[PDB]
Amino acid sequence: FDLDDSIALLRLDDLYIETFEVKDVKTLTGDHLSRAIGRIAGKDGKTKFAIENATRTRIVLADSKIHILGGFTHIRMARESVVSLILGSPPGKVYGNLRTVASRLKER
């Protein structure tokens, strides 16, 4: 993680790290595995940056290993979106669902 993002751990007392692995979600191999990773990042990192802004977390896509830093509910709101791309959902649809959750955060 970036240093400035990591300083939040010192700043906060309710920030945790959620870590899991793509084969845990679904057994992907070869080019199928590589494509799934691209979907999480997206073009120019656009997809992760969407996941980044809306759910209010940071995500590190270290090859097949994903680490999510944020609040407990917020990391959980980040996780399913990551999981959904792995299982085959197009980035465009989750972008719509992602912008829905972004709303309920600002009202609450």
């Binding site: 590589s34 494509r35 691209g38």
Partner: peptide, 10 residues
Amino acid sequence: SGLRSFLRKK
């Protein structure tokens, strides 16, 4: 493009 560009970058 697509995977080819990524594989080119490596």
